[PDB]
Amino acid sequence: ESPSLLTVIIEIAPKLWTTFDEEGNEKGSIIKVLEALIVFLNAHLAFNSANKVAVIAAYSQGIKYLYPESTSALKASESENKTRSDLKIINSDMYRRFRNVDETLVEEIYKLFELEKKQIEQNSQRSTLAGAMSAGLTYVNRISKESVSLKSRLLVLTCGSGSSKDEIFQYIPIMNCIFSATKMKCPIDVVKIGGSKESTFLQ
Amino acid sequence: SLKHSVTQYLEEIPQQVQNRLYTSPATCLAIYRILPPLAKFFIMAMVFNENEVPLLDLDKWVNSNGKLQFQNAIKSMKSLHLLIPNKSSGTLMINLNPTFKISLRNALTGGEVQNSFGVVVEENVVSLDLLDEYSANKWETILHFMVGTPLAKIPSEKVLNLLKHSKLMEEVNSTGEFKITNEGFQFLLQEINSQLWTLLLQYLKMIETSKMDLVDVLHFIFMLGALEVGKAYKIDALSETQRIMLQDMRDYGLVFQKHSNDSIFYPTKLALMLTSDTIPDGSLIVETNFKIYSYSNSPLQIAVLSLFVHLKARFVNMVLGQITRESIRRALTNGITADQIIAYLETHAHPQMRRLAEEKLEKKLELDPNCKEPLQVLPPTVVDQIRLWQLELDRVITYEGSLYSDFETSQEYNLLSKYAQDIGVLLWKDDKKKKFFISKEGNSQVLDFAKR
Amino acid sequence: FSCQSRFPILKNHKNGKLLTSSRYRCEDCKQEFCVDCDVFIHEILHNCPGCESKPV
Amino acid sequence: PADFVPDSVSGMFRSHDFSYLRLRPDHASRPLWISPSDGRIILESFSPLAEQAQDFLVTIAEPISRPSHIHEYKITAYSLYAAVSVGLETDDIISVLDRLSKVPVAESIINFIKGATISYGKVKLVIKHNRYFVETTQADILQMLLNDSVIGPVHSFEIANESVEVVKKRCQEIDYPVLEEYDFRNDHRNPDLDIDLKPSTQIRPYQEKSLSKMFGNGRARSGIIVLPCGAGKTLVGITAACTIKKSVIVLCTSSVSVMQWRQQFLQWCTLQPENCAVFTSDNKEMFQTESGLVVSTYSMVANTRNRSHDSQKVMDFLTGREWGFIILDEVHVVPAAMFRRVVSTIAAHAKLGLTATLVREDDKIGDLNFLIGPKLYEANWMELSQKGHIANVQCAEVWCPMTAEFYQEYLRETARKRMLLYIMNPTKFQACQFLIQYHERRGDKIIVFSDNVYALQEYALKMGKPFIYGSTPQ
Amino acid sequence: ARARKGALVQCDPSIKALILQIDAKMSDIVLEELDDTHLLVNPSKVEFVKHELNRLLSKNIYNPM
């Protein structure tokens, strides 16, 4: 009926995911959760013709936007979109509405991974997840005011992996996001992968 | 309307034809959109898991506030043959359609698509400069043909035979003109996506030949919905049947092939408009003295305004017209009922009558708060005049048929009259006058009743 | 930063040059925001996402 | 045409497709559409600059219709005549039409404006001691007046007193229209009057607008002002008499209107009863002052029957007195055969036609331009209804189905007897009885109109109600 | 059970009166009289009597010029 907006907050932290890999019996779990996210986004875009997708990652040294791609794409050498530098990660016989969004997001994933590898020498003691879904609600309101209506929803791909405990700086911004999401009636969905059973603030 | 219409059409599809239709991922993706959101959610939840899920789990999934919606979705998916109901362990086990599930998973997980989405040849133009006005011209050609205004360009014979076999667009060649039915202006009521949908369901009701199958037509229209505008596609994936309908809707303008037998066909914006939707042009002004001031510049809006409004002049902004009696007579001799014209006036009213209408409704509620009145966007004087013209069209009504009289016994008259009343063909009866009349459609039934 | 809307060029004319750059910097994090982001972060939200992306 | 190809849909317009007029980009603030075919003006009241547009058009055009949203106006000759009489030039009007309209003003419209507005005020009608003179500022117009020579012995010639309307219509059908404008400020032959409005009398803004249409440039202009009943057209007559301050004669349809108008002068303005006079059957005595006022009936003057010697002397006095103003109340009866002559027998400088019903079944209502003058002011009925000046009437039409026997006898009857039959159907009896019964319970005073004497008597004897027809005692 | 192929009409008694004087004008218009609202009109002249009745009510209405 009424289309919605699927905003997704991805928590990428090399320490968290690699401690999940060490605690688990497998290596490369983030590839699995990444392709699961991709088929989820395809399912969401299959749900309705006009619903939209936003995905945001919260890496160690800040946050970056994964889909939709930054507006620096200018059909130049630094366009980095569509056929320009279209490195074959997903098959080209894909549905084009799925193909464009998935190929763009995986290219942005590889670019973020390259940038984070380039700054692997510095270990951040600050987690950028709370500001990440803060900007998620900000883009939610951007879509809501630009398009007249449209629903919205958040997905949180968080990971504890038994290494990061419940932090104290993640108290105030999380409830700021709670009140903001309650203002625009945006549900907040959180899935936590790791050995830590309970995350009280996210609950 | 639209979703209900295509759902009832695909209800008419046989189960084996539906199962063959579920082969392509594009068809499964298209029909996935046509399910209700509860139905869509349950189907996609059933897609990824090979194990079959009992119906009690799905019933427990739904809150009590949406039990009716859940039952309606169950009815829709059962009628759509997407479920295999299984009877095991005293439970009505439910399994998804396997071909549908596999094709939809391939459409999601990037599996086998067999080029159901077409292939891009990377030679293309912009839609606005070439494709958009071509689609507009090809649509307006058949529109201005069917409204009856003279044209320098007339469409092909295929759409003419389609309109002849259609319920609308009655044709006469001994006179030399094309008569518009009520269903014609009903077609002009809805917006062009559902217009295209009704056109294509009438097309599928037309095409029964051995030259054309059915699943290929549905595959082609659903991939045309799946195609994107601004990139050409190669004709090789289509069958020769799908190629001759590619030519057929190239004549329609749904697709722009720049020349016949070319290998590159360009999707037009009507292809994306077909799936789902998204002061205006055609917004008109009516007064107490039946005057028409239409903010319209497209020829189609003022062309369909010409059928029921005596147009006096036309500016670059306005079309000066007047609702005369004779224009309304021209409408009603086409079968165009008055209420539909009233609805057309309501949908095309200017926002200034809208603000004055909410103003007078505010005055009505501040004067008589005990009662509430509907928002009459246009004054009731012109509406009353149109209704009086409609009533004076049919001051006398002439029902034709047969009448039985001359009964020497009252029981024979009573038995024949109650037989006519039971089959619902009697129009009048009285034992004093010893006469009763029956309709023309009920003449033959009562005649064979009396003969036997 | 918070909604990645393209900042409008919003050039008045060629002789009118560039005026009213819609980027709103935050003094604690040096992150630019648009007008809608400013009028969202300052009453509905109460955190600066730029102040939070900073790895302190 | 402005290089615009006709469309397939444009064929249903009988050369009225004005789409060649190019849309202006700033057309949202422009509330006007100008039709080049006939000068019809389409005005939107909801748009910005609406009141400027509406008072500009009522200065320059006649309103064909004024509904709520879109108003219809007609550019005619007489509206332009009045506009240039009160001081509006051609190019200013053309410029503000160009500024206030979306579509550009076509060449035919500008040609019509310039053709109508120019050559106006050339011929002027003046009265010098009850003798009509046409005065022209240019000499060759006298030579152009060579066809209907009705001369009777600066550039002027005398006209026969009964041929003045023929001269006016001759001048109207030529491009030099006749002008009369009483300059009472520069008039010293006729003695002035001390008539002035009482300080306790209040005047309404639409009456002031009508007077400003009449008293526009600085001279008293003859013409027609129509107002609703109860809007105070009598007050406009009183105020016009107080403005001109010259000798005023009032012609009324009825003697009761004569005494009512005399009461209006005695009540609303500072006019002494020795300055006011009555010409009727019972009353024929007049003011002895050098300038005063008289109210009389139309058939005082225009009756050709054998009259009294007193009435003979009175009408000789009226003919021998030069009047500066005449108030022709209920002007729609003036185009009758006798009543047309009262503007020629009575030589008055300014003629004001006051009425509420400016419509006739025959076409002689159009001749009042030759009789009185151009149409000055039209009062908006809905505007006066909404602001509490005239009542909010609910016009209704009650459909009485004709009964079977009455219709059966009705289909073979002659026309006068046809009316006699369909007026007396019982369904109208029941409808009128119910309406009287219901609205009497509403505390509403009801007046039931029925022209036939037999009809009103039958209804009144059926319901036991009073009836007043023609031969009832006074 | 004798069948006559006729067209019943439903109208007010005024239209019934009009079509009965049309019957009084020319022979085969209405066959028998049934009620004050129901008459059996000959089916071969349905559009014909419509063409008379709309013409009759044309003088009943005023058409402004």
Ligand SMILES: [Zn+2]
């Ligand atoms: Zn922003």
Ligand SMILES: [Zn+2]
């Ligand atoms: Zn900050």
